[PDB]
Amino acid sequence: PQITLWKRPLVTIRIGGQLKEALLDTGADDTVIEELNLPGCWKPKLIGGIGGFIKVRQYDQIPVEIAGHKAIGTVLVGPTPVNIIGRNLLTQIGATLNFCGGGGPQITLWKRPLVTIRIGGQLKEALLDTGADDTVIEELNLPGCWKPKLIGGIGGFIKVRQYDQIPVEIAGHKAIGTVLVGPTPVNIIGRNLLTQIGATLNF
Numbered sequence: 045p046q047i048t049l050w051k052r053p054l055v056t057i058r059i060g061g062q063l064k065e066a067l068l069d070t071g072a073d074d075t076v077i078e079e080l081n082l083p084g085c086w087k088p089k090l091i092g093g094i095g096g097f098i099k100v101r102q103y104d105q106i107p108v109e110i111a112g113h114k115a116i117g118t119v120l121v122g123p124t125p126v127n128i129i130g131r132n133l134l135t136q137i138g139a140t141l142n143f144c145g146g147g148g149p150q151i152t153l154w155k156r157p158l159v160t161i162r163i164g165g166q167l168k169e170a171l172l173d174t175g176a177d178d179t180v181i182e183e184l185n186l187p188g189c190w191k192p193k194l195i196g197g198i199g200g201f202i203k204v205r206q207y208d209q210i211p212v213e214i215a216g217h218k219a220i221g222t223v224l225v226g227p228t229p230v231n232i233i234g235r236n237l238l239t240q241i242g243a244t245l246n247f
């Protein structure tokens with residue numbers, strides 16, 4: 045299918061014999077599912093997100109059916125806020141990111157989808173994150189008026205400054221919209237701007 049990003053890219057998955065809902069997340073290295081029992085041996089691991097680090101159980105070689113496409117790989121189980129399918133399984137089902145419906149660059153997901161953006165007259169690297177509702181940029185002295193906001197994800201919440209109607213060029217594509225500034229480890233381009241550049245998931 046081709047999936048646009050006007051809404052969250054939520055799909056049904058089958059895992060351990062049971063159906064769950066999960067978000068197709070290009071900003072996630074790994075697949076993370078809410079606490080559940082899985083048949084297997086597991087081992088403890090720690091993973092991080094926008095809000096810090098959490099402890100998870102790592103299960104290897106778990107079969108997962110994702111909107112009808114088969115994958116067999118690593119699944120992490122823990123207190124994630126949202127079930128997410130990350131790049132480790134997206135690559136298995138042949139998922140790519142495509143601009144302008146496939147007329148623009150195609151980005152594979154073997155590595156993190158990092159691209160060059162321009163914002164406030166600065167060039168920066170940013171992650172294309174289909175699991176992010178909003179765009180979050182590293183501490184930057186952006187001029188303008190703003191309002192406080194808290195945003196969350198794996199690990200909890202951070203406080204950010206919300207600026208509206210900020211122009212942002214993404215791999216040469218112009219966009220304009222809301223940008224959140226705060227202490228993120230990685231600059232993230234979220235759906236609010238991805239939709240403006242015609243980005244789709246395809247598999």
Ligand SMILES: CCCC[C@@H](CN[C@@H](CCCC)C(=O)N[C@@H](CCC(N)=O)C(=O)N[C@@H](CCCNC(N)=[NH2+])C(N)=O)NC(=O)[C@@H](NC(=O)[C@@H](NC(C)=O)[C@@H](C)O)[C@@H](C)CC
Nearest residue numbers: 071072073074091092093094175176177178195196197198
């Ligand atoms: C769980 C909530 C949904 C998915 C998540 C994916 N975001 C990426 C951002 C990148 C880090 C800042 C992420 O956490 N990725 C993790 C997922 C966990 C994982 N293991 O894959 C990751 O790749 N972590 C790497 C660390 C990043 C660096 N890795 C690297 N360079 N190889 C890791 N291995 O631990 N989205 C979010 O965190 C966003 N949250 C949201 O969109 C919504 N919030 C919630 C609570 O649902 C919205 C209502 O605010 C943030 C950015 C605000 C817009």
